[PDB]
Write an enzyme that holds these catalytic residues in place. Structure first.
Site, PDB file in Angstrom:
ATOM      1  N   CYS A  33      43.151  42.904  35.387  1.00 20.00           N
ATOM      2  CA  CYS A  33      42.518  42.483  34.138  1.00 20.00           C
ATOM      3  C   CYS A  33      41.531  41.328  34.373  1.00 20.00           C
ATOM      4  O   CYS A  33      41.918  40.242  34.822  1.00 20.00           O
ATOM      5  CB  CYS A  33      43.601  42.147  33.095  1.00 20.00           C
ATOM      6  SG  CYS A  33      43.113  41.111  31.701  1.00 20.00           S
ATOM      7  N   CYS A  36      41.946  38.143  32.304  1.00 17.34           N
ATOM      8  CA  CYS A  36      43.166  37.533  32.826  1.00 17.34           C
ATOM      9  C   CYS A  36      42.909  36.765  34.121  1.00 17.34           C
ATOM     10  O   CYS A  36      43.473  35.686  34.322  1.00 17.34           O
ATOM     11  CB  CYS A  36      44.274  38.577  33.039  1.00 17.34           C
ATOM     12  SG  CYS A  36      44.592  39.646  31.603  1.00 17.34           S
TER      13      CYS A  36
END
Ligand SMILES: *SCCS(=O)(=O)O
Length: 106
Positions: A33, A36
């Site tokens: 991600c 992230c």
């Protein structure tokens, strides 16, 4: 380096009770991600700046069971706990809102 990895619902509920009266921040993330990856360093830096806050990490690919139960739809989602209660939450790799929400609840 104060972020503990949560690998089970067992561990999660144990960690929450171990926290006592301290604020608990949980980062729901994935390794693939992008957003992230951006905020991961900052999240970790925050762990050794806010010593009276408990910082946890849950990989949603490992813990699909837990992510569902916690109603993670996208990541990173940050979920905040005191005693055995959810006291806050937002989704998004928003550095400003993360520290702000830490301060508004510690
Ligand atoms: S995010 C925690 C979900 S549950 O275990 O409190 O239902």
């Amino acid at each position: 380096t104060m972020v503990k990895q949560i690998e089970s619902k067992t561990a999660f509920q144990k960690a929450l009770k171990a926290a006592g009266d301290k604020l608990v921040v949980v980062d729901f993330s994935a390794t693939w991600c992008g957003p992230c990856k951006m905020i991961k360093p900052f999240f970790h830096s925050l762990s050794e700046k806010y010593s009276n806050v408990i910082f946890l990490e849950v990989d949603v690919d490992d813990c699909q069971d837990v992510a569902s139960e916690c109603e993670v739809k996208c990541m990173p989602t940050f979920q905040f706990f005191k005693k055995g209660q959810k006291v806050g939450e937002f989704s998004g790799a928003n550095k400003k809102k993360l520290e702000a929400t830490i301060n508004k609840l510690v």
